[PDB]
Design a protein around this ligand. Structure first.
Ligand SMILES: [Mg+2]
Ligand SMILES: [Mg+2]
Ligand SMILES: [Mg+2]
Length: 271
């Protein structure tokens, strides 16, 4: 992991600024076309958040098709020595989802910029309006199912002693007060910790430093397999990332999420 190998998964703006010219760095911005054009971290390559999603029924939060991933990753310059640093401007949902995609393509070396652009801007760090050159054509990817829980896999695990389901939606969605599918409620046995509750707004949307204790209060502990989800596996990108960042050995993103679970005929719902 060359220049980044000594760092933990979640790095600070200072760590990234010192390493902006590292040749192995693939810096990925998942803010927005407007934010990226207004000014991005120097050398950052834009990945519109919509491109991280299949975006088609019945489960739009699934990973994009092979063709789209192969093109995307060739555009970013995916290569053997690459080290990805990922950020967004919303506290890490899209960044964390992109890191789940990095696990899907088997990429081992990557970091999350704590607080993303929010923290970068809060510290008045340099911005660029320049475009890096896309590396090239599509790369042939090896796609992995390990990082992702399927609907059927999750159905078979429900109620297991060794499972925690981290529902990253708002509490109103978790309790079925705010219903965005045929069925309202949550997956049986799941616990709720909204993605934004994991951020610290007083520290530019970095991950709260007391996160471990808060996850432990909900029984989300590293000795359990953690399956996390929201409506489309956007918000649960952050929560997936946090579990990985804390060193939890068994973490899956339930990509279908509530857009699938709340609408599928087979899935039990609990209020
Ligand atoms: Mg946004
Ligand atoms: Mg092929
Ligand atoms: Mg709220």
């Amino acid at each position: 992991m060359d220049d980044f190998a000594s760092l933990p998964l979640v790095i600070e703006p200072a760590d990234l600024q010192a390493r902006l010219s590292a040749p192995e760095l693939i810096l990925v911005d998942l803010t927005s076309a407007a934010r990226y054009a207004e000014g991005h971290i120097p050398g950052a390559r834009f990945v519109d958040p919509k491109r991280t999603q299949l975006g088609q029924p019945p489960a739009p939060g699934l990973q994009p098709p092979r063709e789209q991933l192969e093109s995307l990753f060739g555009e970013l310059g995916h290569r053997p020595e690459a080290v990805y640093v990922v950020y967004d401007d919303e506290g890490g949902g899209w960044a964390g989802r992109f890191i789940w995609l990095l696990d899907v393509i088997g990429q081992q070396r990557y970091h999350y910029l704590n607080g993303g652009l929010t923290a970068w801007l809060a510290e008045d760090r340099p911005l660029s309006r320049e475009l890096p050159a896309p590396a090239g054509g599509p790369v042939a990817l090896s796609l992995h199912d390990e990082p992702t829980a399927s609907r059927d896999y999750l159905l078979g695990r429900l109620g297991a002693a060794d499972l925690a389901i981290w529902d990253a939606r708002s509490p109103q969605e978790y309790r079925g007060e705010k219903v965005l599918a045929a069925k309202g409620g949550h997956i049986p046995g799941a616990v709720n910790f909204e993605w934004t509750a994991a951020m610290d707004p007083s520290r530019a949307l970095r991950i709260r430093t007391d996160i471990a204790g808060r996850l432990e209060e909900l029984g989300i502990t590293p000795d359990k397999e953690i399956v996390t989800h929201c409506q489309t596996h956007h918000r649960s990108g952050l929560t997936y990332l946090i579990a990985k960042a804390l060193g939890y050995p068994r973490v899956k993103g339930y990509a279908g999420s509530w857009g699938e679970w709340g609408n599928h005929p087979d899935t039990p719902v609990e209020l």
